[PDB]
Amino acid sequence: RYSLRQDIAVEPVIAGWYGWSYLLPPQTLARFVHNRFNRIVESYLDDPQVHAAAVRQRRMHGGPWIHAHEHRDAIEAWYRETAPRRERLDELFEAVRRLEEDILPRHHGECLDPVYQELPAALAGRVEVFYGRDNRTADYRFVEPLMYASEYYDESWQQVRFRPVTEDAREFALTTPMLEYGPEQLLVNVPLNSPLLDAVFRGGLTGTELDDLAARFGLDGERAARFASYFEPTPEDVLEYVGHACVFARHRGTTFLVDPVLSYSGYPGGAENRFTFADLPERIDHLLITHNHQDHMLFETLLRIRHRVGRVLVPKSTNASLVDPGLGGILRRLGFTDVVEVDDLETLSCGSAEVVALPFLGDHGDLRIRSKTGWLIRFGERSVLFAADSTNISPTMYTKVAEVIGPVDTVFIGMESIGAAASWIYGPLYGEPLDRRTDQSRRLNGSNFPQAREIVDALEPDEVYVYAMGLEPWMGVVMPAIVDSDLLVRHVQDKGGTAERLHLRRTLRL
């Protein structure tokens, strides 16, 4: 009997690209493909040189640049093979532009029933329209499950690409098409929610069982043998930090994992003491996610642990808009079948703990998005709060919050006190651009020193760690402020308590 090697990664791929939340729902896919992914490809076909030149200065990583510039011929063939896809998806892009731009501004406060009469065939039956607060300006929302039911959500445009992992750091993956760039890699068509991937990550297969598996993925010849080679012979009360904003926990034998992202292992030259896919218990009872940003809920990680998961807790949103579509339903298309959505300050009991959802402000470019929460976990008398990227930009909200929830022992706050422009993530979903100087004042930032101070001062914790920092090398898949972190470590220590910025790993007494 055999199992996947710790040093093979199985990378999520949707419509040619490294896979994440907003590529799943056809209506957001379409805004990205049209307004970003085609622009990146065409720009590259025209001058491979810019991209190479760009890729070479480390400091230009994260821009709209293809990292496998050597492979011009393959990329061109791929673009052209997929033209009927990019074209059926543009049919949706046009419907939506048509409704936001030609149909909705026609109306000024009267009955809207005349609109369902005029909807593009793409949207017919799949949207609801209404006025906003002024009663005169018309808006809309998608009926999400009907979208997924439509021909525009297509499971066949999904894939996984197996490849070896030889070191800690990761190259920035979001702007480069997912293809077989080397014989070590294996690109395979399967839907992301498939139970075949579950077979894989679970393992314990005989050699003939692997052949069967591999034949159900439609593999044979050398591909089937590459596939086979990715497999090797099958070999309390804790609070473990493990990377970026990901924290593991056992409490009277119930397991918790917050904002999942994990590194790999099985290769020379690692970093001592990492917490890896290999360090995981049998079952993950409760998976918690603070928001919808890749650094907090990485598809690659999630697909891998899916088979071990009990319940997923996530914050409730019903906007069913482009900028902000239902987290919970995304998780369901990924194959998670027990997902619970929690409103502000609702309380769920979890094994022997109690989990409370907390209000979470900012980090989203002052955009209309409801998928954010922090979590407070009460393990009997000790009680820990995970705040992720949430910033304290509303003076008293924390006082009022404390009045309802009682005292808190331990706090994790994230101080990416300056990060990206919000258009960097959300930009292709907008309707038209903002004028540059405005767009510029709309950032994704974590709490800085003063804000962070006032969080601490209003919750009176005895322990106070700062995470979500983006230090660990493997976060490079997807992505001054230290001055501030340190200001805070001293503040909290000077006031008679433990504090510490986190990097790489840490056991902690629970």
Residue span 368-387 as binding mask against its own copies, x where in contact by CB under 8 A, dash where not: xxx-----------------
Name the residue with the smallest CB distance to K ion.
Answer: 153
Residue 258 carries which side chain, given as an amino acid letter? V
Indicate whether 404 belongs to the interface with its own copies (CB under 8 A): yes
Nearer to K ion by C-beta: 153 or 267?
153
Stretch that binds its own copies, among 76-84, 233-241, 294-302, 436-444 (CB under 8 A): 436-444
Q: Which of residues 152-181 bind K ion (CB under 5 A)?
A: 153
Q: How many residues bind its own copies (CB under 8 A)?
A: 72
Residue span 121-150 as binding mask against its own copies, x where in contact by CB under 8 A, dash where not: ---xxx-xxxxxxxxxx-x---xxxx--xx
Stretch that binds its own copies, among 59-67, 114-122, 179-187, 248-256 (CB under 8 A): 114-122
**In the bound complex, what is the minimum distance in angstroms from residue 125's beta carbon to its own copies?**
4
348 binds, among its own copies, K ion, none (CB under 5 to 8 A by kind): none
Residue span 184-223 as binding mask against its own copies, x where in contact by CB under 8 A, dash where not: ----------------------------------------
Contact residue for its own copies among 255, 265, 294, 321 (CB under 8 A): 321
Indicate whether 329 belongs to the interface with its own copies (CB under 8 A): yes
Q: Which of residues 264-303 bind its own copies (CB under 8 A)?
A: none
DSSP 424-462: GTTGGGSSSPPPHHHHHH-B-----HHHHHHHHHHH--S
Nearer to K ion by C-beta: 158 or 373?
158
> 231-233 and 382-386: which strand pairing?
unpaired
Report residue 3 as tokens: 């199992």
CA 209 to chain centre: 33
Question: Is-contact 207 220, C-beta < 8 A?
Answer: no
Q: CA-to-CA distance for 324 and 100, rounded, in angstroms?
A: 16
Q: Which of residues 335-354 bind its own copies (CB under 8 A)?
A: 341, 343-345
**Secondary structure in 3-state letters for 181-249:** CCCCCEEEECCCCCHHHHHHHHCCECHHHHHHHHHHCCCCHHHHHHHHCCEEECCCCEEEEEECCEEEE
Angle between helices 207-216 and 195-202 (to 10 degrees): 160
Q: Which of residues 83-112 bind its own copies (CB under 8 A)?
A: 100, 108-112
HSE, CB side, 13 Å, CA atoms: give it for residue 91.
14
Contact residue for its own copies among 42, 237, 366, 460 (CB under 8 A): 366
101 binds, among K ion, its own copies, none (CB under 5 to 8 A by kind): none
Question: Residue 481 — φ and ψ, nearest 5°?
Answer: -70, -30
- Non-local (6+) Cβ contacts of 156 within 8 A are 189, 191
Nearest to 118 by CA among 107, 103, 133: 103
| Residues binding K ion (CB under 5 A) | 153
